[PDB]
Amino acid sequence: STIEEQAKTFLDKFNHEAEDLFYQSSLASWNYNTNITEENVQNMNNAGDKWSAFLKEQSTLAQMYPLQEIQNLTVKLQLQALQQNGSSVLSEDKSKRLNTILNTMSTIYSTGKVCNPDNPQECLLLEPGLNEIMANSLDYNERLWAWESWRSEVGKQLRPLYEEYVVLKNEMARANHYEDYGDYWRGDYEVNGVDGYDYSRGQLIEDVEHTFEEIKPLYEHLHAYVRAKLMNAYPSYISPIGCLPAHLLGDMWGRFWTNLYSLTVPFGQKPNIDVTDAMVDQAWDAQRIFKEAEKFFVSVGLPNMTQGFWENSMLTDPGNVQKAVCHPTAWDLGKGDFRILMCTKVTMDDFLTAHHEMGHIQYDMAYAAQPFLLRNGANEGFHEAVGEIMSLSAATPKHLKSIGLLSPDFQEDNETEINFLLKQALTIVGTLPFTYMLEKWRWMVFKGEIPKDQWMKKWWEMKREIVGVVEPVPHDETYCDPASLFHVSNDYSFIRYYTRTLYQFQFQEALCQAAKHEGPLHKCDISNSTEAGQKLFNMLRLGKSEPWTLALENVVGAKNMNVRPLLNYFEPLFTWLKDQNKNSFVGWSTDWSPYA
Amino acid sequence: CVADYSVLYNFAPFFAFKCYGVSPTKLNDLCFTNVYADSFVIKGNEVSQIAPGQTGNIADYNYKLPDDFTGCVIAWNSNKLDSKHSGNYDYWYRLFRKSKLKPFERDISTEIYQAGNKPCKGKGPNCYFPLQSYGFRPTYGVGHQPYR
Ligand SMILES: *[C@@H]1O[C@H](CO)[C@@H](O[C@@H]2O[C@H](CO)[C@@H](O[C@@H]3O[C@H](CO[C@H]4O[C@H](CO)[C@@H](O)[C@H](O)[C@@H]4O)[C@@H](O)[C@H](O[C@H]4O[C@H](CO)[C@@H](O)[C@H](O)[C@@H]4O)[C@@H]3O)[C@H](O)[C@H]2NC(C)=O)[C@H](O)[C@H]1NC(C)=O
Numbered sequence: 001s002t003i004e005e006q007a008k009t010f011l012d013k014f015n016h017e018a019e020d021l022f023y024q025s026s027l028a029s030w031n032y033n034t035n036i037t038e039e040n041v042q043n044m045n046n047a048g049d050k051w052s053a054f055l056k057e058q059s060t061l062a063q064m065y066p067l068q069e070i071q072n073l074t075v076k077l078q079l080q081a082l083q084q085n086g087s088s089v090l091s092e093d094k095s096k097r098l099n100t101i102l103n104t105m106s107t108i109y110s111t112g113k114v115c116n117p118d119n120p121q122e123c124l125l126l127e128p129g130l131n132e133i134m135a136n137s138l139d140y141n142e143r144l145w146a147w148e149s150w151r152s153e154v155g156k157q158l159r160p161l162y163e164e165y166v167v168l169k170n171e172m173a174r175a176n177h178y179e180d181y182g183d184y185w186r187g188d189y190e191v192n193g194v195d196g197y198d199y200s201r202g203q204l205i206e207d208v209e210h211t212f213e214e215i216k217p218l219y220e221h222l223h224a225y226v227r228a229k230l231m232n233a234y235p236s237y238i239s240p241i242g243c244l245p246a247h248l249l250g251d252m253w254g255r256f257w258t259n260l261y262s263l264t265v266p267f268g269q270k271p272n273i274d275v276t277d278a279m280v281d282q283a284w285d286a287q288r289i290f291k292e293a294e295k296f297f298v299s300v301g302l303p304n305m306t307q308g309f310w311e312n313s314m315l316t317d318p319g320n321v322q323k324a325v326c327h328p329t330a331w332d333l334g335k336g337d338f339r340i341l342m343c344t345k346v347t348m349d350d351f352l353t354a355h356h357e358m359g360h361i362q363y364d365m366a367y368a369a370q371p372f373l374l375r376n377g378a379n380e381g382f383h384e385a386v387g388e389i390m391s392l393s394a395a396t397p398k399h400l401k402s403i404g405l406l407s408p409d410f411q412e413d414n415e416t417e418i419n420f421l422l423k424q425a426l427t428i429v430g431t432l433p434f435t436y437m438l439e440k441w442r443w444m445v446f447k448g449e450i451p452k453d454q455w456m457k458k459w460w461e462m463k464r465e466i467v468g469v470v471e472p473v474p475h476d477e478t479y480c481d482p483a484s485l486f487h488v489s490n491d492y493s494f495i496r497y498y499t500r501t502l503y504q505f506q507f508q509e510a511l512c513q514a515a516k517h518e519g520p521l522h523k524c525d526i527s528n529s530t531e532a533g534q535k536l537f538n539m540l541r542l543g544k545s546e547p548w549t550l551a552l553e554n555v556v557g558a559k560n561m562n563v564r565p566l567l568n569y570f571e572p573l574f575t576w577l578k579d580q581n582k583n584s585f586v587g588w589s590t591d592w593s594p595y596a
Numbered sequence: 597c598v599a600d601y602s603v604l605y606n607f608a609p610f611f612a613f614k615c616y617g618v619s620p621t622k623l624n625d626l627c628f629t630n631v632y633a634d635s636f637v638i639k640g641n642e643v644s645q646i647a648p649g650q651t652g653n654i655a656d657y658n659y660k661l662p663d664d665f666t667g668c669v670i671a672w673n674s675n676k677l678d679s680k681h682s683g684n685y686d687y688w689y690r691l692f693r694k695s696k697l698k699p700f701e702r703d704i705s706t707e708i709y710q711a712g713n714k715p716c717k718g719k720g721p722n723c724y725f726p727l728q729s730y731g732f733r734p735t736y737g738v739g740h741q742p743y744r
Pocket residue numbers: 081085327328329330331332357360361376380384387
């Protein structure tokens with residue numbers, strides 16, 4: 001009679017049907033992903049339509065039961081998730097326009113494109129031809145031209161579209177309870193109710209700012225090194241006291257400066273840490289790249305996958321007549337029908353991505369006993385952190401030497417450790433300030449603080465100071481760099497990257513502490529040690545039944561993210577980093593611009 | 597009739613041959629007053645629920661074994677026999693029942709009863725169909741496949 005048991009008697013009635021419908025929708029999605037045909041996408045859209053409609057009735061059904069008689073965390077979560085994720089607050093006149101603007105944004109990001117300078121020949125998209133030049137092709141003129149051509153062909157017309165989408169999404173957000181659309185993305189880590197684990201969405205921004213301030217001392221030295229190397233390479237434009245031109249960051253928007261690392265090489269006599277050659281040497285194929293990964297997972301206590309998984313997993317791009325997508329994606333079809341769709345042929349990056357996907361699959365497998373609506377224990381930050389830490393632990397040279405990917409002759413001298421630690425730093429600290437700036441800027445935009453006519457003004461004001469990167473061309477309000485992004489156009493959060501950046505280091509230090517491994521955080525090999533694997537499996541099977549802060553306290557200890565694992569992980573790097581950076585100007589000139 | 601249990605061994609590679617009151621190896625050297633055989637199909641994860649004293653979803657509502665049980669329980673996999681891509685909805689099982697079921701008794705009913713407080717008198721608040729089907733598919737893993 002009490003609503004507490006009425007909620008569960010309603011739940012178990014539709015739980016099986018919801019599981020079946022989700023399985024069918026995922027089946028249609030995987031079919032279209034494997035089979036690129038009009039009927040396959042039609043089946044995707046139809047199955048998604050049934051699932052969304054069922055969520056539409058489920059929202060009202062959940063709203064039927066009051067939430068003031070609910071005390072179970074499981075029942076509370078299950079009832080609340082369907083209330084908002086299967087309903088919308090915007091009326092038809094506004095919801096239809098919001099959906100249309102989202103579709104047009106995605107289309108303009110995809111269809112809208114630029115190519116070779118002043119040539120009506122065969123063209124290429126951003127990642128194939130433009131972001132490729134921005135990433136690896138080290139050429140000032142080409143990168144400088146593309147950095148504005150892509151935005152004038154995509155972000156220019158998307159700027160009014162992005163503004164209208166921001167207004168519409170804010171209209172949707174502020175209606176029920178939120179204060180902005182950024183409150184939606186800040187709710188991925190909000191914790192309330194349970195004693196000893198409480199959080200506020202406003203305090204998350206303060207935590208991100210504090211982490212940025214903590215990384216600032218390292219990031220300014222990294223900026224000094226990058227500016228010195230750029231001045232050595234291109235003294236024509238880069239000043240020894242200014243910022244870094246955005247095009248000279250190994251990408252269009254600076255996140256992973258791996259090619260910029262090549263110019264900023266600490267030691268030219270770096271030994272071989274590459275096992276890509278060893279893949280050919282030791283006869284590595286698609287199956288083995290996952291087989292030794294499974295062996296490593298078993299050695300740490302994580303059970304392998306079933307043969308049915310391997311008989312439904314696509315480890316190699318089909319090509320031929322039925323083309324597919326080579327983008328790494330691990331698939332959980334439902335009811336123990338895990339799949340995959342990615343490529344692993346001859347490279348060490350294939351090995352790392354295999355560990356990434358295997359960690360994700362094991363994490364999803366662990367909480368299989370949890371209820372379907374509680375299968376959302378895959379916290380995006382925690383999920384990506386686990387995927388990254390598994391590859392980080394398996395990438396240690398000790399594990400490769402033991403397996404056979406490397407040899408005992410090669411040693412971890414100062415040159416080697418400095419080289420790979422600084423290579424990882426150029427991708428981690430390379431993206432940390434930019435990620436923080438983007439998150440804060442989009443939060444303020446969705447809050448309405450940034451004027452619609454001064455988006456780029458505030459963007460560059462923060463870029464020159466917070467990021468220490470100044471635009472190589474006088475970019476202005478006409479274009480929109482964020483609008484020309486895949487995640488933004490598809491309306492995807494980016495706080496996931498910033499959270500996982502510290503979450504992975506917290507997980508790594510927790511694993512090394514639990515296993516009592518002897519060695520630094522940059523050489524932590526826990527292959528044959530499963531002691532930390534037991535606690536890792538406990539956290540994996542916890543699922544969405546306990547707050548993520550509680551799991552972090554049980555494993556790491558600190559409820560909030562901490563930079564100290566990053567600090568002592570980079571300390572051997574920091575020793576050499578200090579010497580080569582105090583010589584140059586630690587600061588940068590915000591007023592100075594690369595375009596003279 | 598002459599009861600030969602040898603034909604049962606080679607019929608199928610059974611993975612569960614629990615025998616309670618009689619050791620299986622002596623089954624060929626005994627005589628019984630009467631023999632009863634019952635057949636049904638369930639999912640893998642419910643296989644453990646077929647035992648005396650054991651309490652679960654299936655035992656409490658569908659098939660309850662008395663404690664004084666002297667027979668044998670045999671279960672073998674039949675995934676490839678009754679797996680279809682569309683969904684094997686032809687098989688049905690009771691999703692939930694109002695009251696406990698007496699051992700060695702069966703209930704055939706589909707009346708939509710009120711599983712709440714206010715009398716439903718039809719489909720509505722907390723009033724649901726007692727039965728519920730399931731779509732077995734060949735791509736399913738162990739635990740969601742037909743078992744005889
Ligand atoms: C409320 O309802 C919404 C939908 O209405 C749900 O949102 C979905 O949440 C899931 C879970 O996170 C999302 O799945 C994830 O999507 C990520 C986005 O990737 C995009 O970009 C890549 C290109 O890089 C595309 O290929 C891809 O198709 C997407 O367009 C993925 O990156 C995630 O993959 C990660 O994990 C897998 C392991 O499974 C790894 O293999 C990957 O490498 C990667 O690390 C993941 O697939 C889904 O996209 C969301 N949908 C939408 C529309 O946003 C909410 O979850 C739901 N909330 C509840 C129920 O509480």
